[model samples]
Target: MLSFQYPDVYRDETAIQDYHGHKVCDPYAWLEDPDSEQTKAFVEAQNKITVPFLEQCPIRGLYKERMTELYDYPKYSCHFKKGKRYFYFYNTGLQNQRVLYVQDSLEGEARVFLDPNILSDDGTVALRGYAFSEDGEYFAYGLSASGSDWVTIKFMKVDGAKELPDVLERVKFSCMAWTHDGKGMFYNAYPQQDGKSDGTETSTNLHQKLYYHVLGTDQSEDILCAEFPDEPKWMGGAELSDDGRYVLLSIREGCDPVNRLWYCDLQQESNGITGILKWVKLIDNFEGEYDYVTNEGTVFTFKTNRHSPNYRLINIDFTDPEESKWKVLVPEHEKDVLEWVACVRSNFLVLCYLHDVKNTLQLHDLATGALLKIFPLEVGSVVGYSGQKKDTEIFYQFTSFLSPGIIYHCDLTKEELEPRVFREVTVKGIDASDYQTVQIFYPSKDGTKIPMFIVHKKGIKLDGSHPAFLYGYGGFNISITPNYSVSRLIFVRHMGGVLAVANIRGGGEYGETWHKGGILANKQNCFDDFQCAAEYLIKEGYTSPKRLTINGGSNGGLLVATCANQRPDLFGCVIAQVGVMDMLKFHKYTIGHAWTTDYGCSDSKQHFEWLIKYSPLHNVKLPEADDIQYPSMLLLTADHADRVVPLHSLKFIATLQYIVGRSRKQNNPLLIHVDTKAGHGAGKPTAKVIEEVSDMFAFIARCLNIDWIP
Candidate 1:
């Protein structure tokens, strides 16, 4: 019944390892050398077969055509005012990158201020982080190569859109903060990298140093402000206070939501900084996250989790500089998690909270931190929010499963603050009213209630017949909030499928407690919860296991792969997008060392035992002969994904094919789709996103034997 044979792969059986006395076979270890000729040919052969399967599928073309049509609508983010000019990022339908536009005023004609699509013909060079000088005269922007975190910072004059000669390089996970004088900037960067600048290298990134760059000066002339030699893992960035009098340096050792805050009074130094700053320890340890909110001179207000896990706004005085003297302006809520607080319109505090994963906005007095009014909101997520201390208004973006998005402009000066639709992103011929979304909580294996959003065409029968797609991202304290997706909508509209977003454990939906439940020794909860979600859909007559397809990306990809191995009978097909499949050696790669906060490094014997039990690459086994087939799988990886790397997918897929089908019990295909010139799904061209989704859904359709409704 198969249209073609799967590509044959050679495995080196002698490549074995002994981890803590437990022997493990890593026969495909050679695939980790992505630059090797054999590895490249392996990718070529895999794609040669994989690409044809997608190209020949009728569903892939149909999905791609509809996705293109839907994506061809203009999309705009919330507009923010800087240097008396209004600015926002906009994409006119299917542009490779969003162009930043500037206007003289709110009602003035908008002109393209920066177009990144012109940076590269293929749109591989993308605009990353950007910041404006205090006076808005100088524009500092970062350009990334092939979606890698590595960025090159450049300077520009805003008045005539002229390019400046200043260039800074070898920056990653950096920040650009301009001083009030606008003569210099403080940023973080690693030592200059020589040779290959491409993002394919998997070398570990270590030792970051913060530097201060003067205007019109070469990077070699830049002054070193701070360097952490003892704390080699400490990656830090500087933030200029709103008053521009002090520089707050936040240091993070890992991906935890905590940081060590340090500061220096820039106001004390009248002359330009010539050497390393004399920094005073604000919070010497990373016990909790102390987010810089705003400060009134030496008195500062910060949203923190210090002794308040739900998070509260507290004012700290630099003159006192003692935690005992801190004053809680806004206390933590018992149930709702205070997500973020923005000081807008000079005297008002805009508080956004996750009321059970749905965003709720509140207006409060900054001085007293007293509640003013709670803005009513639909069941959606606030995707974008922009405001300033001097502005009288702010804009926020809101969207849900059935809605594309709406940019809400709120006037803080109004008698009662109200949000008005400033702009709406809509696609032609898509009626949002035809869809229905409902949230349900299902009991996990440990009896924990996990919330899930189920979306489908209105009036569809729940008769275990419709093809179902379930997705989740349950790591890094990130919440899988409700948002509109063209592919998910198209799946429901055309394929007659149901879309489910599982709010599983390990997410920040409820708070740090929920996130901790899914990490470290408790990491098995994520798999258990995902499997329970699939079972709930089947038990509730939403879809049968044979018609159920599960998908995830990045950390989410790990969740999908773990669950597929634990319960292959519960899923018809699986898609792991850029997954961290090999846990034992992940930390040896670039930036993977930073994830030790959640993943717990394999270097630790205890963590090694925990990882060896569930690692996707080590746990590849065919389901009992009764099932004959491990569910059809599609593992997606990008050649340029320096964050997760292609080796995770390559080795996992190679192991899967060699291990599971060794004795010819497997019937379903174990496939890998290796993408070129794309990284970790960020800054990917619209065409590439559509193409990947089309191929993924097409493969799922083939596995599930589903056809388009039309």
Candidate 2:
């Protein structure tokens, strides 16, 4: 009795399966629920449509057994160091991560540098640095156990005979870079505070400070730097200039997503944190900011909307001390394009520009902004970039929505680019090509346009009956840039399902105006914008109430929850991943106090009134089936995610379950998924992906009544 939206082959799940042998749900969800033969049959048919194209995908060499074994499970974060003798890389691997350091210097030998679980009971150790000193005799590093933002930093002499000093404790130090003489390391840490973000942070507060810890010194003190009392304090992502003379950082304050860059010279203040350090302003504006520095002194790459979201790349040169200054490597233009520009040398810059989300890579000359070459890629992801004086090369990883990642070495020196490393992944028997991606735009309530990226099989019709998956994240002014994802491919494409992404407000897509349109007291604009995107699909015959599913995590979770509560008639299912649904008391927990820079605090009168209007926690009274019959909803959260708006998901789910349990409607489904091993957004690794992909597919299958087989 399913409504017709596609061809008869798609509608006749059993008949199609009889011919294709149960591949419809083969790769997406059926494996998790194979008991239903109908599900198996549908999976077989879907596979017939999917598997062949998966074979032709290029860049397949990167997924070797060695690569998978190395990158098999969850990896916290990774570090790569290109030394003169060998390449060094370290990563946290698989289950119960104990930091693993691998050096390809002599051979590929791996050893545990620091395992937090072993060093400190109940602590999860995270590595913070690999800075070798000036003469390479000593090195500095940092570790964080107990999953705290605070890290204990230490220094070690590498001469084989020196016993490593006892690990420093009590101090919370961030990553470090060595000074020129190797006599010390420069690092920063937030200052400890009794209360921060006002009296609200009494229970969870920390202050940030910059410091220069020497290799053998017994004393440590704060390096006096600029402190913003009038402006909201912002966290810094830092980098030090070569020769360790200066340090540069990116900073943002208050509700604005605009970032600014600041740099301080170490030579000017020599009494070791005793004098006023001069910091010159590199760039400032209410637009987005980027100032990524290279080892070469004269060149730096920056991206900003001092123009627009179609970001422009600019290169600055400080090489000529007499006449050094900033210069635009790629000037701003009206067309929508994004490019990565970094110095290869004082005169040469490596530029990679992509027009739209197509993953096309183009290299341009820095001084003249001339196109040098184009690396035609059906798949691409920038994995690593290097500006070594000895070699001019760019390391890139490329893949498709269906493809596993592949590695490549692009030599800018060649007339035809040559790849040193080209490898693809090996999945059991899945093909990647049956998937198709389509771009579309929907009209919002106010007639504003919302852009969407849709991926699905070509045969599915626009009859408003086909099952569809919608997603969005509309906060922190982050633009949801295009990147190839394997999990998305497994479900949406291989299964004949449609996947859509809505570029909502409260994001940086269109710069300040777009972001402000959906913030604070105007927060309803975000929900309204999402609703318009959903409603437009229904009106256009893409998918309607009983067949459409919407999902979001974190902030997006708030979007889904609000939309579901307001227009329950527009969706068949909604999934809230690590959602923040309770708005009234968000600032009371974890890092929620710091987020006043984004979501206005509920304590404020204007925000308080507006928050209650659509707060998911308070709005969840069992809706009358006639007024607003909500669809199936799943709330996901984790116990270890102490950094998120925790109580929002916990309390909201509790209240929702209570209300739904007493409701008269049997069709409305409500559930919660809580993970004990992971924290907010989940950390790096394959186990994370497996658990994520499995649970997500399972939920979708249950909602759509599709049978899945393992």
Candidate 3:
């Protein structure tokens, strides 16, 4: 019975480092293929690791320009402009976050709007958009911040120094659309308790209704304030007609992935919005879609995934709203590709999709769901869309695994693209494109098929001798889709290795049923599903226990940790990064109070017994056989990561060191790396990213004896 909190320091760090007096460089360093003979000699003589495999991967050499040519540390991204001025929303890593980025023809500096995060600490606050009156004298900013499960809606008027105080807080507040007169904002809300909402807890029921909050007036009443009896569902993706005569809504049934569009006239049934509401479904069971921007009459440009019908996107439209008819304007042509569409101009939609490891953007015709044209950008992810509504042109931020995020301008009317590059740090001889990526899938333990992507070289052998690395995060209904990554590619393709991902149960890949398969008592399915993926690689001749390594972080971290413990005979090494190893203590953490909606609480004896049974931290059974050596293990944690399943790693590592070292007959090395300054998922930047990627691969090499080949 060993126990102690995080911050577990190894007693003998010196025992692990075996120095042979040779300088070891990155295994994928050959991509630098420098022009000079000296550089070539350095790469080949040291170890001709695998010829840089990045080109073989999907998104290699995507970003072609220098970093400084782009914007600075940014928070959000978008390209919006209709008339003359373009608007951009960004966040520069500044003091107290003093700068609220807003851009136009002349790249604008950081300006102040509202920090909804300050008022709402939970990760739910959202600034919909800023509406500048045609006169430009009054600017109404719509803000929706999370309060429990019900989001609060409010607006602030920043016109001629007349700062109307924040709107009174209301329950289930969202869909803040301004009245054409700009005197009030129309929104929806469902009364619920104060705190966080996980959708399953039942203290308060979901009340669906529309309301009008007249500015500077005591006239705030619900148009249809009746408690919906058909089990509470969330209403979202809201928008108002240009004349403010009608309100359109997307009602989502309690995290149900699909949303039904409904509309109501404010003038006719202003007070009748409470009862048997007269509404029409825009589309039949939208797998998931939103971001409605209405133009003339009742016409609107919305972001929807009626394309894959699985992914959500922007730049789509309602060909006929009478029956929720859909016209996917940006009909995506790529097969394994997914898109994140942004509403730029009323007629134009910006599409962000992955082509290899790169993130590219394209402009589309919103009405016809047609791809007008596309633009290629250096590597980076889009944060959010922001700017004055009506303004079609704006700035956006882009960042990559090795590149710090920067803002850029997409002047559509002018047909000009400018990079506001800000971050400037060189890794001296760092060559970024030495990595590669790919997409692959595998079946689960129960014969249920799962999605697992494999990232490696173009012509890598399918032989089971390659050092293969795999990862997965199959919890909280989060979707693991196409994302940019130049660093991880460094290891798989360049280092003669394989990197893979498993989209297993407890995720939204297929739908609700998939998620339910791994929740609570069924959580065993999540772990078992992962084991199935690992073995699939072996059966397919991709890897064997001698060269197979498994890694995951947070809930994902929990997956690999438990899988390694359960089937230690399958993997050569395991990296558990910021994992929730202890199912017993998880409820005591920061957001732990909120996860009870997903992972059942341990207070009940029924849950307690089952939790303890699979709790990785609590169920650390040592390997019994001397010949059957377990894989080498490494635990990665952050001293500051108090937000997630905390310090269990620290305590667990200590217990393992004292006991496993003394009891186990195997000599599989074990280590722990606690980052001093970062917390939870160590966020943005280049060098920090390098360290993370390097640390992971280093552990695999050290444990499996897969030395770097230049």
Candidate 4:
């Protein structure tokens, strides 16, 4: 038997609360205070045991070396244009952060515009949001420390490469938009609570107000443009039009994609656009999604899914300001889902669609509904795309399991055009011909045809002895398309394993109907779909339960944890990263209430019953029989995670270890891995990412009894 010591956890059995006539006991509730000394001590005690155990793994160094070698490739972003210069982000393999570069022309000499790597020693300070002025004279960007969502906005002179005196603080979940005159910009931020100025707090966010900051002025002198004090939970932000003649305000009540659209006509005023004193409601209802594409004078073009579950494009004239005057520009298709639309050359539009989970790009005439051309693309994902109404050129980046990222430039000046390769990423010691990705439709518990992508080395035997890894996320209308992952590629390449990704319900794979099929009271559909996927893998002779490991992060973390608890005998391992485990209390945290669209709040009796049934923390139980095996599990959380608080994993792990400690079968390990100076996934440095994934793969290898191929 492996010898490892588990930390002693404190339990307070008296912490009880009544929910909808049911009383629940929370023994580890005191661990919620992440900043308290007691909580820090608990974290230290746990890490003291976990860190040494992970570091001592025999193949840990091998995994780290392989990951570093595989990830050491030049990465480039799509190019955007402003004034006479083109800008993009680039990283010369192994850099901690990507550097923004600007060029005078398409092939001009590029110079460094912003390098986030030099902002901090460990690369914890990240560039958050950035926007260039209309004339490209100044640039505005946001920065945050330790991957927190909170950001501090700053400005710089693009031409002279000098920092400006203007600074804006407390910005989060907002976009920066410059006015046409380049005098000031608009952004949104939350009010400071309890005199906190470091932009780090665990309090619930409320009263997010939009402000206009004039250049060379202190943040205190910024003018407030809009706020929703009556509906404190609502989030509002502003985006300027291409011509700066109008300002569009998008107001979201929750995490749903639907929003209430408001517009301010700056051209109505005799003087330049002043404070947003008078605003008109364009789309007052939040029943469906509406995205402003482009506008000509008072006539606006919008991509929406009002009547069609699949999206379509339409033109709404602000002169009439009524639904009767709205005309359909492009009708929605029955089978394909419209994903994105961008205007180019001022008279043409480019549309991206997902046909059976594969991307397809089409060009269309903006004035008429006639189709112009369809761009041929490999059956993969379009990760990035850029274009403007007045520009005659467009660029897009595509990638998949077998293909590295390739950026393509399309010149729309010609009557007939095709996308040409601008840049292609080449990684050392990696070949696409050695592996293959296949798409399959597997039936879930309800006999619903769920789509999944499986990747493995070519010509592998269909034996049940292979180690397999399954991943999924089924919430927030987020679609799981084909994308490249170096960690998974390494897992399959060197470890002789298979990688499976499930596009389950609650995602926008099909449309709103598919998303609604797996949320709220139907959230159980996500767990059921994942369980069916595991069963299919085992039954189809790919892998057995002892060799299968399930992994996910963020919302997917909730998926992995719930499925493991419900069917502990289905898999051999579990890795949950920064997951939302405590569902009943999730809405009480920062920005958690916004997710009530997917997860119904517990204030109502119906929602309470629904959440209490599958809440990971509230439902941890010991196995009824000694023969049933519990999966070896790792719960990862960061100290700076304010999005989904670290307390969720803290309390859940403590309870899991406590209950499993009394079980007759204790061979499987239950551990929590906590990281310092990292938040919820985004803006994480390359070194930290490689380190974390290495530990995870090492643990999985040990559990599955897989050895290094070399």
Candidate 5:
């Protein structure tokens, strides 16, 4: 076992709080003030100690070497056409960020359109959101710095890629919806506020307001489009109708799938977007999700869960504006979830459905909503889909645990409409033929069946001798689907390990019914389901407690940490990345309040009762109370992580170090890895992702006491 003296930490005994008269002491609460000098110094000191400790492992370099070699494969996004040009994102093996490439036609030569690698030497800058004008004459893209949610939008002309004078700032959690005239666009953001958090503590982003930005105008000159003063909690986003005659605004109080829909007509010559411009409140209740699909004149089609939890497409005509007038275009499947819909070739609709969790594609008549054909697809997930109302061609990317990735293109103009392979991701020095993957259902604590995909070498024995890597994220209505991962591939190929992705209850795997089974008062089901998955692996002769390592990020991180607390002896190692540990106070931070739709807020007496029972920070097991020591924990956080915030890991790690590490009986190392220039794991550069993966895998090996296969 690795041996070292843990760093000294100062705890304030007076740091205490009361929830519903239930008092608790958080001695390390000082770390919560990320802007303080002591907190800054503390993280720096911890960083100094972590570097040397991880480098001590001799196999660390080899992990990175092999990982880099396996990741060097050309990958491409589905091709999307704008005007006469086609654009797609391409990563030539090891570029820090994928470069956007554009061509005049499908067969035309591709040229570099937007290269972010040249923007920042360390690959910290990334493209967050982008859109092309209706006529494809201009392009608007949002650039994020250091992986933070704050975005700066820049304008450019498509023909010569010339930069425009307009630059929009103070934008967050938004998308650009270009006006039909190519003269302006709509976006969402918060008004300028003083004393924003400086990469430490999180400052709540409240009162989201939408604005209209015209070409060649400074952000200050942008017209205020919409704001919800009466509903301060509502966050607003807008989308222009396919015909460019209406602005459909989707408003949500939180992250709930339910939304409040509204619309406005800016296409009229007299309607100048100088004010909110007479918004027509259509559906102001969060009854169900109403995702705008397409529109013809005043008739709008939306995929909704209003009457069907499994989802269906319904058409709402603005002229009628009555419940009885709304008509169902495509009825909901009996069991399958209608995932998404796209309008293409003007008269056709392409619908994607999640039957069992794997995706299936189909074509239908836009007018009658009659099924025309079922497009065949392999057992995998649809990673990307690109289609427009006017285009006759569409493209989508697919991948499975065993397959790298494939981009398929289909032309609706052809007599026999069929998808053909356009691009295939092929990595050097790898043989996919040696691996096998399967979907298995296991019973959970409550006799509920949970789905899991296990990947490993084809001929491995069922002796419970191999190491297992079980991963899960069972919250926020997010599904853990099958997809190709180079890191997981290397774990199976080079580490002699089995990779398992647990489709637990909190996700929308089986639609809203499955998602509701694992949230709020039922949140414990997620932990139970995950623990059952681990037990199932061991019972099936795949792995054991001492040989098992569990990993999760974000909401999934909460799952891992909770399980580790509830069943401390079931895992050998735990990696919780940017987890929400302090569940009791999670709602006070940025966007955490929105998550209350799933995790009921502790502000209520009933919610506090349920939350304190399983909140990771509040339910930490005392080593003295148990015969077994806690497993080796590698809690990960980053400085610029405003989403879940570093304070979560900082306070969580401090509690573990003080309550567990300070004792003499435990030898398993408890550590936290603070990544620089990284956030809640979106649009991060390849270099940063690879480096972190290499270090964490080495940590897993060391904690599990397993040998590297190569």
Candidate 6:
């Protein structure tokens, strides 16, 4: 075994802050400044120690090769339509990025519309967002570099794939919606800061505004559609109605799904499209999530949780525009939670529901709220649904643990209501039939039943001797549903391991009540539920503590970190990737302030007490006994990760090294892996993703003493 040397880190004990009534010490606060020379040196020194240790893993190369082989499969996205063209994205196995393709008809000649891989040599540049003009004549796309949130919007003529001179800047967290006339479009953007359009600085996002940009014009000539300088925290976007008669302005105060809806009558505006149009407040409160489904003249349909925690479909007639007069088209169900609603075939609505963590698709009559038919789907997640109110055909993509993405096309023109396979992704060397997945409801620490999915080889033994990999993310109403993963499948097939995903609280799997049960003051429930899942796996004879490994990233990373701190003996290894470790100061950076919806602000006395109790950075303590072993932990973060910020992991690992590494009592390796050019996981190149997954699996294999299967 390689006993590595710890890096020398600078910890200024003077870094302290008072949150409400509590004083907290943040000795590694200087690490927050990624541009500082001292911080750069610290990161370099840390990587020097981490890299040598990881390179010594005997199976790292093998894992990387196998992971690459598994990942080298053609991938396709769900197809969407505009005018007479069908558009979709495709990747030929090992391409750095997916290329956008457009065809005249379903079987027409497919031509490359836009190839993001050719934009940059290293594939660091990504196509963040794109929208086609209603007639499919013009294309507006957002381009992002280094996986940053800041994007630059560009225009192109779709005829010869000709580029346009219209370049918009400072676009982030915004959606592009085109006008039906194909003359201009509405989009959201931030004002250019410090005289630079694309500011790379890790600054708080604020003062967003919506603008209407006419094609063939410079962005400086764009019309200001909406702005709330008085409410700098308010972020809003513009969405044009399918008929393009009205432009809807959806305003949000934070990351919460709840928002206030406003609209503008574009047809009534006699102005030159140069000034802000008159705005009408439709839904002026953030009481619940209001998803604009579709509209018919003065009537608008929306999916809202409002009084129904499980969510329902409601219609508001602008003729009255009274909250009390709004009629409920579909009431909340007792067993299933309404996930989404899509207006299809003009008079039909397709509703998606989550029943016991699996998706159920249903068709309904939009005019009468009558159930038409239910689309049969296997035990999997509905990854994507593509259709508009004018179309008679729709397409949806589905996938699960053992299923690669399968796209299905439904023809509403037929009375039988049958969906045929549009395209199915096939893996060269793997047979999905060889694997099986089973979901079991386990009792949590508080006796609440939690659903979990266990997947492995078809005949794997449940004798408490197999290696078990558990994963979870129980916050922000984000449900960790069954999804395809190349690395996970490789781990099970090559490492002889069992993969399990726990649908704990703080997810939208059940409803708002489930999410509320695992956030803020009840955040501890997430840890408890995850710990109970680990216990269930052990008690059920699936795996022992010595062979169990826990993995989670982002919010899930916080879960794994807190669980390791609370119960170090629960697992043999933990992989916490880009976690929010410093809960007390998380809201101070970038867009972290928006996440107060789930993680209550530390500025509040009540929230502070709740946060300090489980904050990973504040709770790193040596074990109570010399024999109590802490799991081998790998804290992963990226230099460009502005969402969670690298400082969370930097400060966390520094504290861990000081107390845990120095003591040598729990001698399991405590390491950090910081990627150079990656952001918060999205838009990362294929090579970087494969490298990280390989390193992670290699670390887990080393920690549990698992050998290569072959």
Q: List the candidates' TM-scores in order.
A: 0.98, 0.74, 0.58, 0.98, 0.98, 0.98
Q: In candidate 5, what are the lDDT values of residues 309-388, reduced to their tens digit?
A: 78899999999989799999999888888888999999899999987779999999988899998888889889999989
- How many backbone overlaps does candidate 6 show? 0
Given candidate 5, what's the lDDT at residue 664?
A: 67
Summarize candidate 4's per-residue lDDT along 1-710 as a digit string, tens digits.
Answer: 34776778778979999998899988899987877888898899888877776777677888899999889888999998977789999999888889999999999999999999999999999998898898888999999889788888989998867999888888988879998878899999888777443323457888888898889889998888888879998887788887788989999988787999998888665565555547898888798777988888888888888887778998999888787779999999997889999888898889999988889998999899689988878889999988888788999999988767799999998866977999998777768889888888999988999999989888888889889999999998888999888888888888889999999999999888888889999999999999999998999888899999999898899999998789999989999999999998988877788888999998999999899999999888877877985798899988788888888999988888888744658688888988988889889999899999998998898777788885
lDDT of 6 by residue, 1-710 (tens): 64768888888889878888678888888887777899888888888877777767778888898878878988898888877788899999888889999998888999999999988888888888888898878899998888777788999998888999999887889879998888898888887565323323557778888888888888888889789989988888888887788888888887666899988888678765667778898888888888889989988899998888899999998789888999999999997999999999999999999999999899999998899998888999999889899889999999988878789999999989999898998776678899899999999978999999999898767799989999999988887888999889888888888999999999888889999999889999999999999999999988999899999999999999999999998889999998999998888877888888898988889899899999999999988987886789999988778777888998899998888888857678889988876788788988888888888988888777899875
lDDT of each: 0.88, 0.57, 0.55, 0.87, 0.87, 0.87
- Tens digits of per-residue lDDT for model 1 on 624-656? 656456888899998889999889999898888
Of candidate 1, the 10-residue stretch with the lowest lDDT total is: 190-199
lDDT of 3 by residue, 65-120 (tens): 11121322334445444233333444452222222333344555434445544543
Give lDDT for model 5. Answer: 0.87
Cα lDDT for residue 238, candidate 5: 91
Residue 620 in model 6: lDDT: 94
